[PDB]
Design a protein around this ligand. Structure first.
Ligand code: HPA
Ligand code: HPA
Lengths: 338, 338
DNA sequence: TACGCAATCGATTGCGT
DNA sequence: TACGCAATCGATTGCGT
């Protein structure tokens, strides 16, 4: 079709090309003619033809986990914004924590020759670590590790441990000493890391968390429901709960309310994520906020760099959580005594 | 690189190719050699090279609106599943209801030569209608109209009017006659359509909805908050509210609770969407369920058809809403009198 | 029998004149 | 000065032998 254009305008295609990309000077009339031909023919240059010739697709691949979950969804949207903004195209892939799915998506990606790769796989067993190295040639940034687990990628780190600690401290500072916790999968950063930060704050305070008070969630509302229920279902119950993710938390409120428990009058609850609509939870959720957007932009930024400035050295940038006081926490029995 | 392979295996590339695609018979040894070469060289065939030669990219484009919103997010995830499943690649684009953004994304899409297009633009002013026609050559399905607004696309229709009516009736059947409503943007199907279905049920019942009882939302939690508040902020208030979308609804619960209003003891509320976590709203939300997944799969299916079976005629399939009884509705003053 | 030649798909870009 | 020739980017596939 570029031939079709040239001919209509009676110039070579080389010409058509340069005018299309302003890649060299072209006489007005000439330009005009080309433009005209372009219009009638209703021409749209193939980006594939071009990608073949130039050696880059101007498209980036997001190897995600799931995309419905608030947390993820929020990140992804951030990511797309940046792509769009710098003319990149986004290929979204959810491997659902499945190796096969993940091997598959990784292959299509390389095949489709994506300029770079955004990685959000949640859990990283060796085998996954392995595959990724196998593709170290395509530039990539992992967005969900707590620390850099490989020299062949860039990493954006969230300080989930310091976020967990922040959560514990708050409770402690508000008068609590009988706390429970519902963490996310230990196989994840946002899971293991948040817990531990939180646990350090407890040891520091000589607070012991009875194992019947720790219940594993999977970041899903239903998981928060079951755990909360199991915690309050007990003879002896905490006066406060630390829930590893806002969504699971929303599930914890439900249950409490279903047991006719008052939040935060009968139980205080603090989340983690500060998902877009946590403020509208009932009650407005107190939580630790994760800078999801900066988390996306920053990742996209390292990618571009590696891409354009052709950096070779793995890099890593940290981002920081922060506390958001809303209304699910109330003073505890020991407030007055500090 | 395909040359590199051939040579290592001392066969032509034609050979390499057929073995790679099992496109014709190849001697065992031969196959073997090729496979071997493929391995050492660590070969990944360019899908772009191939797309150029075959004339299809095996990738589909989703021209969305936003992707964080529960409703959307849920659809998109459905969509990706199907792509993956039939080997398609997904390009996600959010035009945020912006013509320019939308013209831009549409262009990149054509340029990237996507096999088909999935359309979710929410609002369709003429100008948008115009652009789309300009690309009628690339196959496409609109997923959010209430009726077919063009002969050049396939359409999947949701019966949002019958869903709205379902909502009104429920209330009526539960004893209510003083109702308010918070609809989504009238410029959208899910907005205008739901309202009207709902309004028909009212006229049928000789119920009049005082304009101070209808407050426009934008499907966002904050919008539900403000509206609910404005409704209950009044001297005279309804005993029941019909909220146009679960998320805005979640915002309505918040407000009520903030005004110390009881749900559904002081006010009954019914949503629309049956978003993944409406069951965990506090209280568990009664709502109209939209078959989001079938909505995605069905769309993807029409697309494939047009694509493969090269259909030319616009088609349109309807999907159906249904009621989900949870706990935000309570009997009304007139229950006993029917 | 089993495989290879050469032209094609739509663009870019270094030499030239 | 302002533009064009021809080779290249990585694959497919119809004829042949
Ligand atoms: O893995 C996760 N899933 C869902 N929400 C989350 N918030 C933090 N981590 C996660
Ligand atoms: O346009 C919409 N936006 C968000 N949620 C929705 N649910 C129905 N329609 C919509």
């Amino acid at each position: 079709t570029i031939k079709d254009v040239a001919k209509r305008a009676n110039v070579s295609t080389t010409t058509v090309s340069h005018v299309i990309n302003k890649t060299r000077f072209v006489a007005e009339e000439t330009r005009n003619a080309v433009w005209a031909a372009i219009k009638e023919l209703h021409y749209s240059p193939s980006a594939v033809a071009r990608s073949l010739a130039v050696n880059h697709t101007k498209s980036i691949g997001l190897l995600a986990t799931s995309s419905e979950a608030a947390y993820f969804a929020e990140i992804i949207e951030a990511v797309e914004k940046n792509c769009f903004q710098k003319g990149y195209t986004l290929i979204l892939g959810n491997a659902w924590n499945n190796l096969e799915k993940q091997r598959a998506y990784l292959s299509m990606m390389a095949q489709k020759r994506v300029d770079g790769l955004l990685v959000m796989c949640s859990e990283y067993p060796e085998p996954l670590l392995a595959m990724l190295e196998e593709y170290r040639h395509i530039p990539m940034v992992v967005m969900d590790w707590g620390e850099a687990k490989a020299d062949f990628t860039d990493a954006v780190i969230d300080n989930a441990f310091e976020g967990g600690y922040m959560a514990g401290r708050y409770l402690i500072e508000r008068g609590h000493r009988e706390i429970g916790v519902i963490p996310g999968p230990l196989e994840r950063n946002t899971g293991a890391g948040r817990l531990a930060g939180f646990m350090k704050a407890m040891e520091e305070a000589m607070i012991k968390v009875p194992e019947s008070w720790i219940v594993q969630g999977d970041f899903e509302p239903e998981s928060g429901y079951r755990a909360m229920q199991q915690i309050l279902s007990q003879p002896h119950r905490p006066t406060a709960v630390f829930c590893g993710g806002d969504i699971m938390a929303m599930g914890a409120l439900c249950a409490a309310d279903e047991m006719g428990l008052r939040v935060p009058q009968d139980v205080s609850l603090i989340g983690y994520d500060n998902v877009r609509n946590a403020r509208y939870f009932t009650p407005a959720l107190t939580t630790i906020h994760q800078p999801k957007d900066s988390l996306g932009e920053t990742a996209f930024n390292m990618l571009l760099d590696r891409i354009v400035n052709k950096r070779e050295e793995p890099q890593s940038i940290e981002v920081h959580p922060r506390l958001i006081e809303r209304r699910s926490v109330a003073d505890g029995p020991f407030r007055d005594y500090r």
